[PDB]
Symmetry: C3
Subunit: 374 residues, 3 copies
Amino acid sequence: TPVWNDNAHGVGSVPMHTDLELDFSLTSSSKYTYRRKLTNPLEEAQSIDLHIEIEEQTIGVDVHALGHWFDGRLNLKTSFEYPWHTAKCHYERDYTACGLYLDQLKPVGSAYKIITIRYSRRVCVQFGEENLCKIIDMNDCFVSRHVKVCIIGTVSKFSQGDTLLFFGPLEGGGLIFKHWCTSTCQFGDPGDIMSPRDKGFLCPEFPGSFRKKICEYDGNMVSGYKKVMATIDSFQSFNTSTMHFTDERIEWKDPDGMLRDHINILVTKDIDFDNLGENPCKIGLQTSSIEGAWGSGVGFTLTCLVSLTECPTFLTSIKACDKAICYGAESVTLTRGQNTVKVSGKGGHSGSTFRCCHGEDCSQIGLHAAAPHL
Amino acid sequence: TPVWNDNAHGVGSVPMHTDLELDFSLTSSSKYTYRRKLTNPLEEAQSIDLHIEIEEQTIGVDVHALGHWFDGRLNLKTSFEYPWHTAKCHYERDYTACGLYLDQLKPVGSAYKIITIRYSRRVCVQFGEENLCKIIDMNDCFVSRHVKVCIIGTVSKFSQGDTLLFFGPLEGGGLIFKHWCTSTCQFGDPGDIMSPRDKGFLCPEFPGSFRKKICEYDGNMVSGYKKVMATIDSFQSFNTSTMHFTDERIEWKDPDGMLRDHINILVTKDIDFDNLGENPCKIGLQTSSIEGAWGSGVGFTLTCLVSLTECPTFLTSIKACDKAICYGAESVTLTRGQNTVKVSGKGGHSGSTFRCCHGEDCSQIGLHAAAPHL
Amino acid sequence: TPVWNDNAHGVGSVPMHTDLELDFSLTSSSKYTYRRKLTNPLEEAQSIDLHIEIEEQTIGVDVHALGHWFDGRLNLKTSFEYPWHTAKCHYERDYTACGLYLDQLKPVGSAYKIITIRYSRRVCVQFGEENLCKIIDMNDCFVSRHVKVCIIGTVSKFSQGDTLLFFGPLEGGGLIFKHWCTSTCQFGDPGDIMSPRDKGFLCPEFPGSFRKKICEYDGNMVSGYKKVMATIDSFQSFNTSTMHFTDERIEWKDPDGMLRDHINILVTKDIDFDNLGENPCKIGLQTSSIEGAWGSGVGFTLTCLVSLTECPTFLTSIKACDKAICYGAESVTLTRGQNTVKVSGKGGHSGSTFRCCHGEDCSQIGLHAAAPHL
Ligand SMILES: *[C@@H]1O[C@H](CO[C@H]2O[C@@H](C)[C@@H](O)[C@@H](O)[C@@H]2O)[C@@H](O[C@@H]2O[C@H](CO)[C@@H](O)[C@H](O)[C@H]2NC(C)=O)[C@H](O)[C@H]1NC(C)=O
Ligand SMILES: *[C@@H]1O[C@H](CO[C@H]2O[C@@H](C)[C@@H](O)[C@@H](O)[C@@H]2O)[C@@H](O[C@@H]2O[C@H](CO)[C@@H](O)[C@H](O)[C@H]2NC(C)=O)[C@H](O)[C@H]1NC(C)=O
Ligand SMILES: *[C@@H]1O[C@H](CO[C@H]2O[C@@H](C)[C@@H](O)[C@@H](O)[C@@H]2O)[C@@H](O[C@@H]2O[C@H](CO)[C@@H](O)[C@H](O)[C@H]2NC(C)=O)[C@H](O)[C@H]1NC(C)=O
Ligand SMILES: [K+]
Ligand SMILES: [K+]
Ligand SMILES: [K+]
Ligand code: NA
């Protein structure tokens, strides 16, 4: 007969036994503070200090670092071992030999492929001498005995698969590219000339033809960087503040003040809220195996061994997390005893050890995923 | 003076005459159950059984089935009726004849073009001996005399125009392509070699040049499938559960437990809610004509003859539906007597008979739309 | 100790001291009207007229007008000053001279690049003899002493960077293109042949090769318009109603009745709401400088000189606006005295004079931004 479930983040309330509601649309890039002494109607001398602090919206993007994009010049030469044999990016016809090669290479920016986008606000609530701070994801709720804070919002600026380009120390801003070349890179494309890491170019294709007249090449001669700069107003910029780059992840606060989200704060002073996720179930967790990759839009799968006690069944979520960042979650009805739960995730880096987690509790160790693009 | 309107799905309430509110963020891939005996404060012995069941979020995607994508090898031959004349996909130069043809063809997956995306949850509410189940679309509300259930959410995983690729019996997962070739398919593109149905290839272009030295071809020689596999981590996977393929439609439950939506449940025990859509207007419906296409991003238009009685005017919505799936809706202020209402829709298949509908009531017959891509 | 903040648009309420709540999901393309006499329980003879009018959802899109897209025929000629020298779009090989040129040109539609998308509803509230109308952006709130109206919604039909094509006097509808050519336009692409203004073509590239046999060209010979028409069902249409084109901006009401948003209306009859943005701070504004461009996805930056009095600090937003349309906003904690605030914006046209604004108050003059695509 019991069907415990903690996937509901929120409360049951009696609207007559609720004392305060704050409901408002808040500038995404703004913090908010509320302070009030909660006093009895007139029939006491007891007051409770309420102090709520909501921080500015933060974006967290799991990415794959693509390395640097380059500008360069396409040069044509004739040989009748070719002179341009040392050039990393080249193309030749063997009739008299005609040759193309890239030179005057210069990095113009750092590119990042978006894997996951998540927005959040840090929310701190003091009620009496209770003090609790939590990072609340957009469309999730802060839940406590006396205070509920729900954030509801939508943003459509960034999409998975977008490529972000930063031209300089671009704590400041960047460009969004929706068509960065991937499976086919031709000279002239956004992303045409890349260096994924320190050394080594991924060279673009040269789709045109040679003619042996003095060699000629009848394909495009203009680099992707120059073609993009020539129509730069066609592309979308974004701005950033307090950037935080870590391996395969970027966090910042978008200073775009045109964006808003919705905040609802409900307070009960005397009788506790009914926490809709309340349960007596107890969970133990360890990792079993992993497969798949970090830094990948295809992702990984973490297998967890999950022990349930004190309940016959428990509907809940098991997460793949590391250092308080979660990369995936699986909703599951656990049965008493041992359970095997597979969690699909995306993101992380080579040093990530993905742990099996429930709520704020995690396994003692995690597992590494494989590298992408091998 | 009267201005009846049923486009508002919700209730007017007096916050003092409301007995229970549930407000929470729910894992999209999780169900939720609430059971409670509603009892009088202390001054009676009468109790009402409240039982709410909210099912896991379902996605319904109206699609155009594109057929199978193929891998293949590009072969080059010389003829001085060509040997490769039986090859379906070929390219030749007539000087000595040089020829390209695709062979070693193999289907690698099934592709589907997204036309419409809609999310929903089935919601069942028992209040006393009243029992009602409804499929509630995201950002719509369940309305009854004593209980309101509103679902508010946003998802940004899929977009109209995306192409979904399933590699095997991919009850399991698939890939999202945002640049599947349409108006120009060149060999090497995602989607380059397609077979729309049983037999018959839509062949890709071969943009390169021949040279008569022994023939040479200086264009790309690598299939789209191989180019995509070589950078597979650049593409976004998704997972599925309890898939349901029907003609030009796919439904499933996304097991991504990182996604949440918002649920609000309001209960009044004694006095009924004010149903904001309440009205005495009566509607009769029949189809008149149709034009446009199923399986098409451009869509169709259903013309309806709509009779209004018992009201001078009625602001409402007329829908194009078949078998309890709706494909389009037009908001309209009807006038007493006959009205002509055009409803723009998208989706459906060759067997669809699009009916004119109001609320849960539909015309006796529907009309077929035309096929796309003729 | 004081920390005034007006970035919160909403109210604090005591759920016992609230008299009416309307909560509902409303068809986006529908208006809504609520009329009620607010009367005392039984212990008075005083009534307040409540009258709420919510208008249909409007979309406002800041765009860059791209001019007209053309259909045309690619012709091949041989010359052994070339005949086709007057043709604006041409390509030649100088061996006998082979030539390509476009002719039979015809405009097929007008194209617009999406820079910004915003949805809104005009909301009018009469409470007693108080009457106030405001345009409320989606995910913002109408706030008054006795009535709060919040709109919460999400739409995923249009995206920044999409190109909208209108084929005729397309008050009626249009097509969405997600891959309109920008940095590389080749003959055959959507957007291949453009005329940005009255005269002057931006000609596409012809990536193929000539051969001197009688000249031959082995590249694509089919215009982008014809290639798109041949697979028109692959593209997404949209419909429009009551269109309003102005320079670099389009407004309309989307008649898609499948879309909904959420409306919440809270009314207190006696005691005023606590306006969460209430403050004694006073602001004076003038422009200082501007840089950047209108009609550009990169945008502009307006520098404002902002004087704060009556408060030590004030957390607020400074906006860049002209004629009651706002193009950007910066959240900022002002300090008493003079402040310099930079506001990033996008949109507008050559005649726009971007002003520094706070709430409904603006500077006496604004500044012009520079033209894009120079
Ligand atoms: C969720 O999807 C993953 C991803 O694997 C699928 O990806 C699709 C894009 C498509 O290519 C499909 O063919 C492929 O299976 C599933 O994980 C995979 O499962 C297979 C079968 O056991 C393994 O061979 C793969 O190594 C494995 N990959 C990863 C990264 O784990 C997964 O099974 C599926 N379901 C769940 C519940 O996660
Ligand atoms: C809503 O749009 C449809 C779609 O037709 C338009 O599609 C645009 C993409 C663009 O190509 C435009 O030129 C085109 O008209 C309209 O339906 C069309 O109406 C015309 C005129 O009567 C007919 O010739 C078409 O057959 C018809 N097509 C379909 C599929 O019905 C429609 O009129 C418009 N308005 C409403 C209220 O639906
Ligand atoms: C917000 O971003 C703008 C845009 O400028 C940036 O755009 C990125 C896409 C990238 O190219 C980056 O290199 C570039 O700086 C910033 O405005 C720019 O600031 C620089 C430095 O002072 C000026 O040289 C530019 O003229 C100026 N451009 C515009 C349009 O104003 C801006 O500084 C940044 N921060 C804020 C708070 O707005
Ligand atoms: K080549
Ligand atoms: K060719
Ligand atoms: K060429
Ligand atoms: Na060529």
